Design a protein around this ligand. Structure first.
Ligand SMILES: [Mn+2]
Ligand SMILES: [Mn+2]
Lengths: 288, 7, 581
C-alpha cells in the first residue's frame, strides 16, 4: 500500500487526477485516520500554516517551492481546498493523499467550502462531472469532508481554524463538545467557526456573508485570554498582502491562493511557526 | 467581488 | 548468375538484382578472386549497369570505386573506373552523387595528363552538356582537378563549359557553378581570372535569383584573394559594395556572414575605405538576422584592423554602432553582440576597456534576456586578464550582489547559476574572498527553492575547486548549521552532506560528514530524524563496509525503534537498501 500511495502522489504531482476507484479507497482510509483526530487537533511545532488554496493547483506547487516539500516540511492547512480554481480535483486529492501517507506531517482542517451545498454552486461539483463522469468522486470527498477537524491547536498557544470566533463558543472545550461529523449547518457554533470574520467595529456584528458573524478586537482579546492563546490564526478572507494582522495582533489572516480566481490581484502568504513557535511569513505571487 | 460568499 | 561475382548478389530477398551490402564492402576482394584482367572485363561492367537504388549500397560502391585504381591495373587503366562512377554521379540521392564526385576527383590525379584529355574531360563535358540536371550539378565539381594538367587548347574548352554552367537556364545548376567558381578560379592563371572569371562572377552576382546571388559572396572571397590589390577597386569592389546593399537581405546576410573573410581577402586599405562603412550599414540593417550576423563579427573584425591606425577606427567608427546595438530591440541581436563584445578589451587596452566597454558590459549584464547576460558572464576572462581582477570586481560585483539579494526569488535563482561560472572563471582565490559569502547565505534563504538551488550548487563548486577546497572552505560552514534552532536549516545541513558525498570522496565523507550525520540521529524534531536515515542511505555506498557495520548499521537499528512513524519506516528502508538489514 505505501508503495501505492507514493505512486498516486507522484502522479497527482504531475497534475494528473486519480481514478474513481482510487478516490473511493483514498477516501475510505482518510476517514479512518481523520475520525481519530478531534474538533481541536493537537499540533506540535515546527509547522507551516497555510490558508485557502481553492483548486489553484499550480499555486499550490508554488507554495511547496517556497516552504519545502512534504514530508520534509510539516504543514497545516486551514481548509478551502476546492471551488473557484480550475483544478479542485487534483488539488484536494493531492492533499488528502499526503494526509493518508503522512498523518504526522500534515494536518488538514475544514473550511466553509468543504461542504455539499456550496460545492454545487462554486465549482468542485461540476468539475467532478467533467473529470469523471458521474457524481461519485464528489460523494466520496464530500463525505470525507465531514470528518475534517474543525480546529487545530499548536502547542496549546496558537489556535487555528478556517473562519473565526463564535458568540456561542468561548471555550476550547465548547468546541471539543460539538459533533463535527455532519454537513456544515447554516448557523450555530460549527457554522460560525468556518464562516465568521474579524472586524473593526467592536463586539459582535452582522456577517455580510449571510453566515457566522463578524467580531471586533475586544472579542478576540477575551477569547485569547480565556483560553491561554497567544494568537488566533484563521484564513477565509482574501487579503491583498497575502497575510494580515488585526485586533492588536490577536488575530492573523492567511490567504494562500494568489491572484484569487485568477481575477483579484492578491499576493498569497504562508506562516512558519518554528521549533520555538516563533513566527515568520512568506509572501508569494502566482507561479508562472 | 466574484459573489459575498468570496474579490 | 555466375560465381566469382554472384557472391556480391543477395539471392535471399525479393528485390531487382539487389546486392548484399556487407559484401559491397568486401568488394576489393572479389577483385582478387579474378585478376586485374577479369576485374575490368566482368566485375566493373557488372557494376556499371545493374544499379538498383539501394542507396546505402550505391554509396558504398561510389566510395569503394575510389580506391580501386590498383585492383584494375594501375594508372594505365583508371579510366575503366569512369563509366560506373559517371553513372552514380547522375543518380538521385545527392549523397551518392557527392561520393561519385569525390571519387572521380580522387582518381583524376591517377589519370595521366594524356588520359585526362583522352577520357576524363570528355566525361566532364557529357555531364556538363547533359540533358537531365543532376548531371550538370555534379559536373561543376570536376573542373578544377583536370584543368591544370591538360593542354592550353583543352583548358579553353573547360572554361567555356564552366561558363555555360554559370549561365545555365536552371537555378540549381547556377548555384552549383557559383559554389565552385572559387576553386575553379584558384587554378586558372591570372589573365584568365581577370578575363573569364570576373565576368562569370559579375554575372552571377547580378543574378535574377537571389539564391544564386547570395552564393557569389563566397566566390568573391576567393576571386578577391587571387587578385592584386590595385585591381580590386576596378574588378570587384563595385560588385561587392552592391552586394552589401543588395535588395535581398539573404544576400546582405551572406556579406555579414563572410565579412572577416572579405576583410582579409581585400587588404587593410580597402577595409578602411570600403569595408568599415559597409560594416556600419550592416549593423544598421532593418532585418535583425543581418544586424545580428554583423554584430557577431565585431571582435574578429576589429582584431584584423591594420595595427597601423586600428584603435582609432574602433573608437570613431565602430564603438558608436555597438552602443546602439546594446539597446537593439531584437534579443537575437543583443544576443550575438554579448557573446563577443567583451573580447574587444585586449584590442582597446586596459584604460579604454574601463572607460568605454565596462559601461556596455553592465548594460547587457542587467538585460532582460537572461541569455544575453549569460553570454557576458561566460566571457569575463579576457576582460579580467586585460584590466585587473579588482578593477573588474569593482564593476561586476555590485551588479551580482545587487541581484543575489532581490525581490523575486526567481531572480535570485538566476544569479545562483552564474556561480559555478563566475567561480571557475575568476579563480578560487577570488571566490573564497568575494563570492563564498553569498553562496553560504543562500543556504539559509527564506525560500526553500533558493536553499535547494544553492545546496546542489555546492557540488558544482567542488567540481570546480576540488575535494580539498571543499574540506577547507565549505564543509566547515555547512556543518555549523546543525546547531541552528530552525529545523528547516538543520535539514539543509543534511541536504548539503547528501550532495557533497557525491564529489568529496570516501575519505573526506567518512571523516568529516558522516559524524555530523550520525550525531543528528537524536534530533528533537522527527523530520530531521528521518532525513538522517535517508542521508545514511544516500552516502552509504560511499563508505567502506567496515564503516557500515561499525557506526551505520547500529544507528539505523536504533532509529527503527523511534516513536515517530516516518523515522521508523525510513530507518527500515535505509537498512533494506544498504543490505545492513
Ligand atoms: Mn472560506
Ligand atoms: Mn475561501
Amino acid at each position: 500500500f505505501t508503495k501505492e500511495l507514493d505512486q498516486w502522489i507522484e502522479q497527482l504531482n504531475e497534475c494528473k487526477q486519480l481514478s474513481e476507484s482510487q478516490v473511493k479507497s483514498l477516501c475510505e482510509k482518510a476517514k479512518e485516520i481523520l475520525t481519530k483526530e478531534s474538533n481541536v487537533q493537537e499540533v506540535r511545532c515546527p509547522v507551516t500554516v497555510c490558508g485557502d488554496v481553492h483548486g489553484q493547483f499550480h499555486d499550490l506547487m508554488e507554495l511547496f517551492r517556497i516552504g519545502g516539500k512534504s514530508p520534509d516540511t510539516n504543514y497545516l492547512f486551514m481548509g478551502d481546498y476546492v471551488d473557484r480554481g480550475y483544478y479542485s480535483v487534483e488539488t484536494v486529492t493531492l492533499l488528502v493523499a499526503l494526509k493518508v501517507r503522512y498523518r504526522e506531517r500534515i494536518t488538514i482542517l475544514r473550511g466553509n467550502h468543504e461542504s455539499r451545498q456550496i460545492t454545487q454552486v462554486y465549482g468542485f461539483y461540476d468539475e467532478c462531472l467533467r473529470k469523471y463522469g458521474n457524481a461519485n468522486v464528489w460523494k466520496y470527498f464530500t463525505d470525507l469532508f465531514d470528518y475534517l477537524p474543525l480546529t487545530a491547536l499548536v502547542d496549546g498557544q496558537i489556535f487555528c481554524l478556517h473562519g473565526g470566533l463564535s458568540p456561542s463558543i468561548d471555550t476550547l472545550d465548547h468546541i471539543r463538545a460539538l459533533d463535527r461529523l455532519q454537513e456544515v449547518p447554516h448557523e450555530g457554533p460549527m457554522c460560525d467557526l468556518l464562516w465568521s470574520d474579524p472586524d473593526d467595529r467592536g463586539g459582535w456584528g452582522i456577517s455580510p456573508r449571510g453566515a457566522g458573524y463578524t467580531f471586533g478586537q475586544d472579542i478576540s482579546e477575551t477569547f485569547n485570554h480565556a483560553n491561554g492563546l497567544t494568537l488566533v490564526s484563521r484564513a477565509h478572507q482574501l487579503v491583498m498582502e497575502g497575510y494580515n494582522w488585526c485586533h492588536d495582533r490577536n488575530v492573523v489572516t492567511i490567504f494562500s491562493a494568489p491572484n484569487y480566481c485568477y481575477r483579484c490581484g492578491n499576493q498569497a502568504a504562508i506562516m512558519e511557526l518554528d521549533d520555538t513557535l516563533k513566527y515568520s511569513f512568506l509572501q508569494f505571487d502566482p507561479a508562472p | 467581488x466574484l459573489x459575498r460568499x468570496x474579490x | 548468375s555466375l560465381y566469382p561475382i554472384a557472391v556480391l548478389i543477395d539471392e535471399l530477398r525479393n528485390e531487382d538484382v539487389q546486392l548484399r551490402l556487407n559484401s559491397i564492402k568486401k568488394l576489393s576482394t572479389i577483385a582478387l578472386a579474378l585478376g586485374v584482367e577479369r576485374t575490368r572485363s566482368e566485375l566493373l561492367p557488372f557494376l556499371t549497369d545493374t544499379i538498383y537504388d539501394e542507396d546505402e549500397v550505391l554509396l558504398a560502391l561510389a566510395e569503394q570505386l575510389g580506391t580501386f585504381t590498383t585492383l584494375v591495373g594501375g594508372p594505365e587503366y583508371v579510366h575503366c573506373l569512369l563509366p560506373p562512377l559517371e553513372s552514380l554521379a547522375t543518380v538521385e540521392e545527392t549523397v551518392v552523387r557527392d561520393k561519385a564526385v569525390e571519387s572521380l576527383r580522387a582518381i583524376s590525379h591517377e589519370h595521366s595528363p594524356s588520359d585526362l584529355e583522352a577520357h576524363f574531360v570528355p566525361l566532364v563535358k557529357r555531364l556538363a552538356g547533359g540533358d537531365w540536371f543532376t548531371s550538370r550539378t555534379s559536373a561543376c565539381g570536376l573542373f578544377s582537378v583536370c584543368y591544370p594538367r591538360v593542354s592550353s587548347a583543352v583548358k579553353a574548352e573547360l572554361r567555356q563549359y564552366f561558363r555555360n554552367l554559370c549561365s545555365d537556364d536552371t537555378p540549381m545548376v547556377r548555384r552549383a557553378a557559383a559554389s565552385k567558381l572559387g576553386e575553379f578560379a584558384k587554378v586558372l592563371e591570372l589573365d584568365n581570372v581577370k578575363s573569364e572569371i570576373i565576368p562569370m562572377f559579375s554575372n552571377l552576382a547580378s543574378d535574377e535569383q537571389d539564391s544564386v546571388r547570395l552564393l557569389a559572396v563566397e566566390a568573391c572571397v576567393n576571386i578577391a584573394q587571387l587578385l592584386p590589390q590595385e585591381d580590386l577597386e576596378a574588378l570587384v569592389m563595385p560588385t561587392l559594395r552592391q552586394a552589401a546593399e543588395d535588395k535581398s537581405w539573404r544576400v546582405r546576410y551572406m556579406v555579414a556572414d563572410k565579412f572577416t573573410e572579405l576583410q582579409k581577402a581585400v587588404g587593410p586599405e580597402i577595409t578602411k575605405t570600403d569595408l568599415v562603412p559597409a560594416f556600419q550599414n550592416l549593423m544598421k540593417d532593418c532585418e535583425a538576422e543581418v544586424r545580428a550576423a554583423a554584430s557577431h563579427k565585431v571582435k574578429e573584425f576589429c582584431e584584423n584592423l591594420s595595427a597601423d591606425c586600428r584603435e582609432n577606427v574602433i573608437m570613431s567608427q565602430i564603438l558608436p554602432c555597438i552602443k546602439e546595438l546594446v539597446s537593439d530591440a531584437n534579443q537575437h541581436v543583443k544576443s550575438a553582440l554579448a557573446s563577443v563584445i567583451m573580447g574587444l578589451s585586449p584590442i582597446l587596452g586596459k584604460d579604454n576597456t574601463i572607460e568605454h566597454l565596462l559601461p556596455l558590459f553592465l548594460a547587457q549584464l542587467k538585460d532582460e534576456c537572461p541569455e544575453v547576460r549569460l553570454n557576458i558572464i561566460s566571457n569575463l576572462d579576457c576582460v579580467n586578464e586585460v584590466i585587473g581582477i579588482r578593477q573588474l570586481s569593482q564593476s561586476l560585483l555590485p551588479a551580482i550582489v545587487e541581484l543575489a539579494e532581490d525581490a523575486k526569488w526567481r531572480v535570485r535563482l538566476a544569479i545562483i547559476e552564474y556561480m559555478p561560472l563566475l567561480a571557475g572563471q575568476l579563480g578560487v582565490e577570488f571566490f573564497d574572498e568575494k563570492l563564498n559569502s553569498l553562496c553560504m547565505a543562500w543556504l539559509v534563504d527564506h525560500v526553500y527553492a533558493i536553499r535547494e538551488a544553492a545546496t546542489s550548487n555546492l557540488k558544482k563548486l567542488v567540481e570546480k575547486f576540488g575535494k580539498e577546497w571543499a574540506h577547507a572552505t565549505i564543509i566547515p560552514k555547512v556543518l555549523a548549521m546543525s546547531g541552528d534552532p530552525n529545523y528547516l536549516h538543520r535539514m539543509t545541513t543534511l541536504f548539503c552532506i547528501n550532495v557533497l558525498s557525491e564529489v568529496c570522496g570516501q575519505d573526506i565523507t567518512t571523516k568529516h560528514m558522516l559524524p555530523t550525520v550520525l550525531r543528528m540521529a537524536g534530533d528533537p524534531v522527527a523530520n530531521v530524524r528521518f532525513n538522517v536515515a535517508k542521508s545514511l542511505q544516500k552516502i552509504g555506498p560511499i563508505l567502506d563496509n567496515s564503516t557500515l557495520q561499525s557506526e551505520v548499521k547500529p544507528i539505523l537499528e536504533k532509529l527503527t525503534q523511534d516513536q515517530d512513524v516516518d523515522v521508523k519506516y525510513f530507518a527500515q528502508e535505509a537498512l533494506t537498501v544498504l543490505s545492513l538489514a
